Write an enzyme that holds these catalytic residues in place. Sequence first.
Site, PDB file in Angstrom:
ATOM      1  N   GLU A  35       0.834  -1.221   0.000  1.00  0.00           N
ATOM      2  CA  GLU A  35       0.000   0.000   0.000  1.00  0.00           C
ATOM      3  C   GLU A  35       0.848   1.240   0.000  1.00  0.00           C
ATOM      4  OE1 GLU A  35      -3.194   0.480  -0.242  1.00  0.00           O
ATOM      5  OE2 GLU A  35      -3.786  -1.724  -0.049  1.00  0.00           O
ATOM      6  N   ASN A  46      -7.572   9.880  -5.345  1.00  0.00           N
ATOM      7  CA  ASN A  46      -8.453   9.007  -6.151  1.00  0.00           C
ATOM      8  C   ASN A  46      -9.432   9.785  -7.004  1.00  0.00           C
ATOM      9  OD1 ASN A  46      -7.664   6.428  -4.951  1.00  0.00           O
ATOM     10  ND2 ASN A  46      -8.419   7.360  -3.084  1.00  0.00           N
ATOM     11  N   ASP A  48     -12.524   9.622  -7.244  1.00  0.00           N
ATOM     12  CA  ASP A  48     -13.661  10.115  -6.525  1.00  0.00           C
ATOM     13  C   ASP A  48     -13.421  11.282  -5.565  1.00  0.00           C
ATOM     14  OD1 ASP A  48     -12.614   9.171  -4.205  1.00  0.00           O
ATOM     15  OD2 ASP A  48     -14.305   7.822  -3.640  1.00  0.00           O
ATOM     16  N   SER A  50     -11.510  11.395  -3.058  1.00  0.00           N
ATOM     17  CA  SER A  50     -10.942  10.955  -1.746  1.00  0.00           C
ATOM     18  C   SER A  50      -9.499  10.776  -1.904  1.00  0.00           C
ATOM     19  CB  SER A  50     -11.560   9.591  -1.352  1.00  0.00           C
ATOM     20  OG  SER A  50     -11.091   8.552  -2.177  1.00  0.00           O
ATOM     21  N   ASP A  52      -6.122   8.456  -0.007  1.00  0.00           N
ATOM     22  CA  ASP A  52      -5.607   7.333   0.883  1.00  0.00           C
ATOM     23  C   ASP A  52      -4.464   7.892   1.644  1.00  0.00           C
ATOM     24  OD1 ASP A  52      -7.390   5.550  -0.481  1.00  0.00           O
ATOM     25  OD2 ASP A  52      -5.847   5.361  -2.043  1.00  0.00           O
ATOM     26  N   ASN A  59      -8.567   5.297   3.567  1.00  0.00           N
ATOM     27  CA  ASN A  59      -9.295   6.173   2.644  1.00  0.00           C
ATOM     28  C   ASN A  59     -10.256   7.155   3.273  1.00  0.00           C
ATOM     29  OD1 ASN A  59     -11.807   6.512   0.524  1.00  0.00           O
ATOM     30  ND2 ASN A  59      -9.883   6.503  -0.548  1.00  0.00           N
ATOM     31  N   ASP A 101     -14.937  -4.534  10.376  1.00  0.00           N
ATOM     32  CA  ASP A 101     -16.196  -4.053   9.847  1.00  0.00           C
ATOM     33  C   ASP A 101     -16.938  -5.036   8.944  1.00  0.00           C
ATOM     34  OD1 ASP A 101     -17.813  -1.753  10.027  1.00  0.00           O
ATOM     35  OD2 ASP A 101     -17.676  -1.653   7.837  1.00  0.00           O
TER      36      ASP A 101
HETATM   37 CL   LIG Z   1      -9.198  14.002  -0.575  1.00  0.00          CL
END
Ligand SMILES: [Cl-]
Length: 129
Positions: A35, A46, A48, A50, A52, A59, A101
């Site tokens: 990662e 990303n 979208d 967002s 990481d 994220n 989760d």
């Molecule tokens: Cl962001």
Amino acid sequence: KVFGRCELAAAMKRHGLDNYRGYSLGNWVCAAKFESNFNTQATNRNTDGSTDYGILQINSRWWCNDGRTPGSRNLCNIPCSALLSSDITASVNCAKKIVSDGNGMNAWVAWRNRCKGTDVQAWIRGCRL
Ligand SMILES: [Cl-]
Ligand SMILES: [Cl-]
Ligand SMILES: [Cl-]
Ligand SMILES: [Cl-]
Ligand SMILES: [Cl-]
Ligand code: NA
């Protein structure tokens, strides 16, 4: 900072990841390698909107607040900035939330793609733990 393999294995073990939710320590070490390249300060934007963050590339759409991810949640209850510390405490605590989760480590797609189905104990081989 940038951990070495065995250094990170020992720290993750001290912070309670070895076998957390059934995943042995080499899984976590392999996930961090793929990662973030063991880098506590890594970030990745990303499509979208967002990002990481940190050693386990957690994220901002779901797990931390960065104030720039529109429509996102903060299920770890932390600013994303906290995850760019050289101390792994916040990242580990949030990873414990994420892996509990209900989806195991599949949350980490570098883990799913590059670690799962390989002999992950090799990642802690020769480490003094
Ligand atoms: Cl962001
Ligand atoms: Cl932030
Ligand atoms: Cl936000
Ligand atoms: Cl924390
Ligand atoms: Cl292991
Ligand atoms: Na968020």
